[PDB]
Amino acid sequence: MSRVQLALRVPDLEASIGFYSKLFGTGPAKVRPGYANFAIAEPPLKLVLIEGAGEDATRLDHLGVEVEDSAQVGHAARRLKESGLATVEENDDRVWVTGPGGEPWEVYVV
Amino acid sequence: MSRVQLALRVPDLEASIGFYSKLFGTGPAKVRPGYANFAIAEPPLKLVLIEGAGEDATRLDHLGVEVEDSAQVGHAARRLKESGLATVEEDRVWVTGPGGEPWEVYVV
Ligand code: NI
Ligand code: NI
């Protein structure tokens, strides 16, 4: 099991939290000044809202695949390199790749 | 059992199909000129690729929740409206976030 992660850079964190609470019918799991997390069961989704003052519209910050444990990150990382994609891994585990249009993807364990 | 729909406007559809096939380990379900879509089981995702032509970078086109049946759409439509969001309905419902990001609830 895994779920997608969608991380949005939003102009108004408070308005966005209010909106996403109503859309998915549940409050954020974690709230800090500067970002909030929703863990949505249905549809399965980890939604990250990142305050991006200055910018005037919501844009994509990055995308991700949240997997159950580190071994899955490892399998993903190996498979991605095998397919010939450039990757960068982090420990404390996460692997990053970038789509041809520049959209960043991370495979990670929460 | 619903799934998110992620629609990306991409500068190069062909390279993108190649990239997502590798990323998710499975080819697209449907391909037309200017358009491809992937139905991914794990993680559950409908990924839509839309040829942009012009833009220099991928951008979010729209977002969605894909549900199993017409009645699920009707339920979401009533829920969203009752919760005070400004919705437009139909079987499809559209709502837009404060930052202008468009959402739709729809059936496959
Ligand atoms: Ni993240
Ligand atoms: Ni769509």
Side-chain angles (χ1 to χ4, degrees), chain A residues 2-67 69-109, chain B residues 2-107:
Chain A
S2 61
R3 49 191 189 173
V4 283
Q5 182 194 240
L6 170 69
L8 304 176
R9 197 161 274 275
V10 302
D12 189 313
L13 182 54
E14 330 188 316
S16 293
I17 289 165
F19 172 82
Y20 286 101
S21 297
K22 298 175 192 127
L23 178 58
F24 296 118
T26 170
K30 200 168 115 171
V31 175
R32 296 300 178 263
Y35 76 87
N37 293 335
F38 294 73
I40 312 300
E42 286 292 331
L45 167 70
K46 165 63 67 64
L47 172 77
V48 182
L49 303 181
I50 299 161
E51 179 96 283
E55 75 165 34
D56 43 23
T58 295
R59 60 175 186 91
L60 195 60
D61 187 271
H62 64 270
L63 298 151
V65 175
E66 179 174 292
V67 288
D69 56 47
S70 304
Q72 285 165 266
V73 175
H75 268 129
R78 176 63 204 284
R79 181 174 56 76
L80 292 154
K81 227 203 300 93
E82 279 182 344
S83 298
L85 306 176
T87 76
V88 177
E89 309 165 27
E90 300 173 53
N91 306 344
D92 329 297
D93 242 274
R94 179 178 291 107
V95 58
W96 287 93
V97 300
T98 294
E103 69 275 30
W105 280 86
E106 59 163 349
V107 177
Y108 69 104
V109 35
Chain B
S2 56
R3 57 183 186 178
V4 298
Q5 181 202 233
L6 174 59
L8 302 184
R9 184 162 295 266
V10 302
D12 184 5
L13 178 62
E14 303 184 328
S16 289
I17 301 177
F19 176 80
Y20 288 105
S21 305
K22 298 182 179 133
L23 178 63
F24 294 117
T26 168
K30 180 169 175 195
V31 175
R32 300 306 190 257
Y35 175 89
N37 87 53
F38 291 71
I40 310 306
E42 290 308 327
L45 172 68
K46 171 57 74 62
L47 174 70
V48 179
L49 305 181
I50 295 168
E51 179 112 88
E55 59 174 38
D56 42 351
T58 296
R59 67 162 172 87
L60 188 59
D61 192 83
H62 66 268
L63 298 160
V65 172
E66 179 187 287
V67 299
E68 54 148 316
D69 55 36
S70 264
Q72 255 224 279
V73 182
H75 294 346
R78 188 45 225 272
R79 189 174 53 74
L80 294 169
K81 185 177 288 283
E82 194 181 76
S83 66
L85 291 174
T87 78
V88 178
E89 183 186 349
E90 95 181 87
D91 293 277
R92 219 161 248 96
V93 39
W94 295 269
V95 289
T96 296
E101 69 275 27
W103 280 84
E104 58 177 333
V105 184
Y106 68 92
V107 41

